[PDB]
Ligand binder design. Sequence first.
Ligand SMILES: Cn1nnc2cc([C@@H](CC(=O)O)c3ccc(Cl)cc3)ccc21
Length: 289
Amino acid sequence: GRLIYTAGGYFRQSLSYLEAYNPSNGSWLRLADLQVPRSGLAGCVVGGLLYAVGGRNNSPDGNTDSSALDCYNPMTNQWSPCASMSVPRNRIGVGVIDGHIYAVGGSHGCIHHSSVERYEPERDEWHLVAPMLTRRIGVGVAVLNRLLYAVGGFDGTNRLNSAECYYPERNEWRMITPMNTIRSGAGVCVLHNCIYAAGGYDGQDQLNSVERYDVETETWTFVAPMRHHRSALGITVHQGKIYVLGGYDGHTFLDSVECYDPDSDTWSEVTRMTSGRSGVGVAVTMEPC
Ligand SMILES: Cn1nnc2cc([C@@H](CC(=O)O)c3ccc(Cl)cc3)ccc21
């Protein structure tokens, strides 16, 4: 589109912020709040609607996992409720294929989901598809060549370097080559022919390392590390550059936004969020009004 939207997140408690960054002028706009605070959600866009999916409201009144799908229209600057998912999914991953949204894994209390469901905007309806081979929360999800990939995460016991691929016409998951790094709460996105996995948590450390999967070669390769170690980051692609937003470095809920240039293999500090936060949902679409 034209703007990087960041929704929700966590600082001290789950957040309701919706803010949009303009790479062209470096500015931030605060837009309409989410109706319910949530961290550990995912964002995506389909047909110029921004969607906020799953997560959890960590608050002093209690902690509630979210099965919610909420619809944001930039023309109106209004959030509307859309169909809820079959199940709450905190620390969810999301992918869009052919205008359908795939909601992947995430947790509900001590339940770590391997289940996967698909949203159809024309019908405002969720349907379960084949489950992943592994339970994954803090799962990175990306789409390339109309195939969905679930990358790393946490299965309830172990943080994962494993990854798998969903073939829609076969309704089937298959393992792919595992990453060289255990990552839970990495940022996962696609750029050209490669699935990137940036940062994450291995159970001891928040990571600055970045690696990429070439679907043709089936191998993962390290690229330049980010400037900041970060888990529970938001990630998006805007005009052939990767943007990473916030996260947690073991000390600070980061406001730092970094930008990856694949030609020069370099990360650069691009802006700061209006406040530090982790577990945000990020997506790109056109300006509001
Ligand atoms: C203390 N700490 N630092 N980074 C962390 C990441 C997670 C993961 C989940 C896990 O692997 O247990 C995580 C948290 C939030 C999000 Cl949005 C994704 C993944 C949990 C605790 C962490």
